[PDB]
Design a binder for this molecule. Structure first.
Ligand SMILES: Cc1c(Nc2ccc(S(=O)(=O)N3CCN(C)CC3)cc2F)nc2ccc(-c3cnn(C4CC4)c3)cn2c1=O
Length: 123
C-alpha cells in the first residue's frame, strides 16, 4: 500500500537487500537512451559558470560511487540526490534545450522505477 511505502521511504533504514534494489534502479537509468547528459559530471568547459550557478551538482557516476560506498541510510536521501540531477538540469538550461528534455524523460522513468522499488520493498 501507499501508506506502507511512504512510511518505509522516510523511516526504514536501507538494508543490503535494499541496496541490490538501488543498484538495479541506478543501472536501469544508466542504460536509458535519454541518460546521455547525466552519466558523468557536467563539463565546466561546455557549460559557462555551471559550478557558480548550480550549488549542489550531481550525476549518475557520483550516485554510483555513493551506492557502492553505502552512503545512503534512508531512501529519501537517495531520491533527494537523484532529484538534484533533474532539478539542476532544468534550472541551468532553457525549457527548449535537449538537456532539459532528457531531464523530463529520465525523471519520469526514475519515478516509475522508484515506485516499483518501493512496492518490492513493502511486500
Ligand atoms: C547536464 C548537462 C550536460 N551534461 C553532459 C555531461 C557529459 C557529456 S559528454 O558527452 O560526456 N561530453 C560532451 C563534450 N564535452 C567536451 C565533454 C563531455 C554531455 C553532457 F551533455 N552538459 C551540458 C553542456 C552544456 C550546457 C550548456 C551550455 N550553455 N548552456 C546554456 C544555459 C546557458 C547550457 C549544459 N549541459 C548540461 O546541463
Amino acid at each position: 500500500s501507499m501508506s506502507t511505502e511512504d512510511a518505509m521511504t522516510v523511516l526504514t533504514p536501507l538494508t543490503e537487500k535494499d541496496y541490490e534494489g538501488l543498484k538495479r534502479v541506478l543501472r536501469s537509468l544508466q542504460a536509458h537512451k535519454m541518460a546521455w547528459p547525466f552519466l558523468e559530471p557536467v563539463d565546466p568547459n561546455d557549460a559557462p559558470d555551471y559550478y557558480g550557478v548550480i550549488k549542489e551538482p550531481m550525476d549518475l557516476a557520483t550516485m554510483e560511487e555513493r551506492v557502492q560506498r553505502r552512503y545512503y541510510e534512508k531512501l529519501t536521501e537517495f531520491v533527494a540526490d537523484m532529484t538534484k540531477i533533474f532539478d539542476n538540469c532544468r534550472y541551468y538550461n532553457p525549457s527548449d534545450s535537449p538537456f532539459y528534455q532528457c531531464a523530463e524523460v529520465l525523471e519520469s522513468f526514475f519515478v516509475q522505477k522508484l515506485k516499483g522499488f518501493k512496492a518490492s520493498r513493502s511486500h
